[PDB]
From a paper:
The vertebrate P2X receptors include seven subtypes (P2X1–P2X7) that form homo- or hetero-trimers and are involved in diverse physiological processes, such as muscle contraction, pain sensation, inflammation, and perception. Each subunit of the P2X receptor is composed of the large extracellular domain that contains the ATP and other ligand binding sites, the two transmembrane helices that form a non-selective cation pore, and the intracellular N- and C-termini that modulate channel gating. Among the P2X receptor subtypes, the P2X7 receptors have a unique, long intracellular C-terminus with protein binding, phosphorylation, and lipid recognition sites. Therefore, P2X7 receptors play a crucial role in inflammation, immunity, neurological function, and apoptosis.
Here, we report the crystal structure of the chicken P2X7 receptor in complex with TNP-ATP. The ckP2X7cryst construct lacks the regions encoding 27 N-terminal and 214 C-terminal residues, which were predicted to be structurally disordered, and includes the mutation of Asn190 to exclude a putative glycosylation site. The crystals of ckP2X7cryst in complex with TNP-ATP were obtained by the vapor diffusion method, and diffracted X-rays to 3.1 Å resolution. The overall assembly and subunit folding of ckP2X7cryst are consistent with those of the previously determined P2X structures, sharing the chalice-like trimeric architecture with a large hydrophilic extracellular domain, two transmembrane helices, and intracellular termini, resembling the shape of a dolphin. In the TNP-ATP-bound ckP2X7 structure, the TNP-ATP molecule is located in the ATP binding pocket, and thus interacts with the head, upper body, right flipper, and left flipper domains from one subunit, and the lower body and dorsal fin domains from the neighboring subunit. First, the adenine ring of TNP-ATP adopts a similar orientation to that observed in the previously reported ATP-bound P2X structures, and thus forms hydrogen bonds with the side chains of the highly conserved ckThr177 and the main chain carbonyl groups of ckThr64 and ckThr177. Next, in the TNP-ATP-bound ckP2X7 structure, the phosphate groups of TNP-ATP adopt a totally extended conformation, whereas the phosphate groups of ATP in the previous structures form a bent, “U-shaped” conformation. The different orientation of the ribose group also changes that of the trinitrophenyl group: the trinitrophenyl group in the TNP-ATP-bound ckP2X7 structure contacts the head and dorsal fin domains, forming three hydrogen bonds with the side chains of ckLys66, ckThr112, and ckThr202. Consistently, the ion-conducting pore is still closed in the TNP-ATP-bound ckP2X7 structure. This “incompletely activated” conformation of the TNP-ATP-bound ckP2X7 structure is apparently due to the insertion of the trinitrophenyl group between the head and dorsal fin domains, which prevents the complete cleft closure motion in the ATP binding pocket.
Numbering used by the authors:
A (entry chain A), B (entry chain C), C (entry chain B): 27 to 346
The structure:
């Protein structure tokens, strides 16, 4: 009959483990998140890149983009010019150049003339925004590599609407001259971009040349009970784009700045901006004591394990 | 006896409660949402602010931004100038200004000289877009406070792909001259921004100074069965950022408008636009009768509670 | 006595079915996704529309927007002009035109005078960006209808962080000269926009006039076990806005390009750009064998079905 009370002890111990460890006495709710970011830093290389230059106006609620490398082509006007030298765009004679837009890779409608691109090579003439943008190989060191030293301030506000409870990842009074540390300052959400790529096992200088995608994962697992109150974030950092060269890594945005000359003709300045798009993913759950939950758990285990206790009871009776 | 059939009655009543109240006969599916917004309104304050002035192009699917307050600094050129005099940017001598150092408060790379801003205030000289933008105190009544009277038309379309059923938050014929009221017109998705912030227990005049974040929460709980058909939206409104002064509330975007002067050198106009970012959160579930589910429920409860019945009959028969 | 071991066989075959089909030996994990898109194509209509022209800078992680139809109003200056002829704006005499307080549909503050719009009709004078933008009905064939032939390259990388495993929807070495095929080339995520709308049962020519919303749904159901390895995406395509005359379909963005005249006064060019906003929705789950999961399943079925077996054993003895 020792085996019997061993089974009873196992059942009781399991019910208490489930109750306490899994907190079956509390209601759970998924958090509702709000993220805001503010960038600080300036790079002076052939131009002064403050935040207004290396950012685009942010209406998104979960991500933000920092420019790390730049290809700029200025004062381009709609006219005729040589195509950029592409396998299908290089020509020896006008017979190679078909009229109109031929493939999706062209920057303009082809006139059919084969015209010099540089001293050495010829290429198909096109009607386009001229001169066509032609580095195509981003600068050997990244232009805005200095962005490694920029800092980002991530204001994350979490809401449990049922519990009417709100938390943020900021200490009650925060000294700005702080840098995030897992143990010493967990409530300092100021991150050096280089440090972020560091925790993601990535080399900023290398990644900055062609861009990429970094996920800032903020996890909240919250107990709102007065006994054992824990509600604080856990950050992890991960690179989301395949780093391998053949698999098309990196990220860039294309944009233009349009101008009008005194004559009235429109002229534009075309940017291809490689950069890192940071995706801020905030998931989490929170729980709080509720009587209805405790009662339903008690009733549930009383029913189920009450049936188990009686069946095991009669089993030991009927056979011994 | 009495206690036995009391237990059987409790079991039967519970199976019925579960079946009907929890609708265990229907398959449930989580909705997939689509939001579009269109803003209407004009403010005449020193300039004519129509939608093209007080919004930025919205490619995001979950949110939209309305400008409420504005700081503009015009005709700034890349050169050297004094930093803006903010405490901890002030200096008496050149040793306080480190050379080539970008600090959290600085708008440019420091030259290392300490230079006059006023007669009275000296500050670290920097290479930056000059003059530096230095209000840091947004206009005392909000510039676009009148935006309180703008209206937003929120077109929400939800799909249940399994059920191949689609719903919108718009009445079958909608008069534009309607304005949302919780009870009188629930399917009028035209909202006065002031009314939204009112529903969020917030003062538009106050919030318009430094900006903020409002969540427009659209809840759908849908029964698609013909005998009890309910599928209509439920709106709630909540401010997501802590409004307290010390915890860094508000929201803004920085952007610039670039021009070129005749010599070709760049000059830009820098905007710091405080405003409200509205985040449209659409959550929801819908359910529809399915035979496979009803059969699974009947089979499940016959199995489990059939075993329970055999326990009570056989086992309590064994005794007495 | 045959019925008893028939019950045992049904239970056993069911345990095996659940184990194998539902893969109860696997830990399951929800997907973490990353999408990048790149647009390629050029349209020649009165101007050269390359990607910098028909797109807006995209910082969002789940969507992208292509312009299909355009209304442009150039050289708009703040001054007085007639309102656009909308029902509430047409007037025969000055008494209908109220001064100052405007309507939500007005483009500027009213002077209170009733002034000529055409030869034929008059309308209320306003202070606004003049001339007001007045087609209100987009061009009868869409101006950028040719975007049908543009291609989009959708780079999707999914991560299972617990299993430390990542996949992408791109073949291991991919030649760009591929076009997506459901069966022949499923790992070629290069789509012609026309073909996208085709798969969604939509006509690009038709949709291009007023725009709309297309959902590109990428589903991953992944088994990472070596003996049964499947991890590849399946795409579906759906139009999210109700295709119907009265229920307000279509999509557009408003933006402006500001210029300065030699005088220094502001001049702007106002765009209403109709287009298709494509939403890339990536959901999925993946699973991998884990010993703790298999053990918890073994223990659970031993517990539950051990009680069931003893119950029916006691029943068959005690009664027949
Ligand atoms: N990425 C970042 N890394 C580090 N710190 C950051 C970062 N982003 C923001 N901060 C700090 O956050 C403070 C509060 O900024 P916040 O109000 O949220 O947004 P803004 O900086 O746009 O200001 P605003 O809301 O418009 O008044 C800023 O004020 C100040 O320090 C700055 C500040 N400044 O930004 O210039 C100057 C200052 N003094 O004393 O000169 C004091 C601050 N402060 O105490 O927070
Ligand atoms: N924020 C808002 N608050 C209130 N109503 C809004 C708002 N946004 C849109 N509406 C109304 O919604 C009607 C349908 O808008 P819709 O046509 O989808 O708008 P878009 O700007 O996308 O234009 P489009 O359809 O592309 O030509 C509009 O037509 C009209 O009333 C407008 C309209 N208008 O100028 O937009 C004028 C009009 N009269 O009578 O002059 C009648 C309308 N109407 O009855 O719907
Ligand atoms: N929507 C699209 N439809 C079809 N193809 C697309 C699309 N988007 C991108 N591609 C192809 O993807 C190739 C790799 O581009 P990717 O690395 O993703 O981005 P970027 O082009 O910005 O990179 P980069 O800055 O050049 O390193 C591009 O190179 C090329 O073909 C282009 C390319 N080009 O973009 O100009 C020229 C070329 N030749 O031979 O001239 C060969 C390519 N190629 O083989 O992939
Ligand atoms: C001319 O252009 C072709 C195409 O890129 C290139 O291979 C060649 O090196 C260029 N020659 C000069 C003079 O730069
Ligand atoms: C100096 O400039 C700062 C700018 O905020 C101001 O606080 C101070 O009163 C000014 N004093 C004079 C004399 O300009
Ligand atoms: C006059 O303007 C109104 C637009 O409301 C239109 O009904 C009418 O046909 C126009 N007549 C012209 C263009 O002569």
């Amino acid at each position: 009959s020792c085996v019997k009370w061993f089974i009873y002890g196992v059942i009781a111990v399991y019910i208490c483990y489930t109750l306490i460890v899994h907190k079956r006495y509390q209601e759970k709710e998924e958090l509702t998140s709000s993220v805001r970011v503010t960038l600080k830093g300036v790079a002076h290389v052939d131009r002064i890149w403050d935040a207004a230059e290396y950012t685009i106006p942010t209406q998104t609620r979960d991500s933000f983009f920092v420019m790390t490398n730049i290809i700029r082509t200025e004062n381009q006007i709609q006219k005729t010019c040589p195509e950029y030298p592409t396998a299908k765009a290089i020509c020896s004679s006008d017979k190679s150049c078909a009229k109109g837009i031929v493939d999706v890779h062209s920057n303009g409608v082809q006139t059919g003339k084969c015209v010099h691109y540089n001293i050495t090579h010829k290429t198909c003439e096109i009607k386009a925004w001229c001169p066509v943008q032609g580095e195509e190989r981003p600068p050997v060191p990244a232009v805005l590599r200095s962005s490694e030293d920029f800092t980002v301030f991530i204001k994350n506000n979490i809401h449990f609407p049922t519990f009417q409870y709100t938390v943020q990842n900021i200490s009650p009074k925060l000294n700005t001259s702080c840098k995030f540390n897992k143990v010493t300052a967990p409530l300092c959400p100021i991150f050096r971009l280089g440090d972020i790529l560091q925790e993601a096992k990535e080399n900023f200088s290398e990644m900055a040349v062609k861009g990429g995608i970094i996920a800032i994962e903020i996890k909240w697992d919250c107990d709102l009970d007065s006994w054992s109150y824990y509600c604080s974030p856990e950050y992890s950092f991960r690179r989301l784009d395949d780093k391998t060269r053949t698999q098309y890594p990196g990220f860039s945005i294309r944009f233009a700045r349009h101008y009008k000359l005194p004559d009235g003709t429109e002229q534009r300045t075309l940017f291809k901006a490689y950069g890192i798009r940071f995706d801020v993913l905030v998931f989490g759950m929170g729980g709080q004591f509720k009587l209805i939950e405790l009662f339903t758990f008690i009733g549930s285990t009383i029913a189920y394990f009450g049936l188990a206790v009686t069946i095991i009871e009669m089993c030991f009776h009927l056979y011994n």
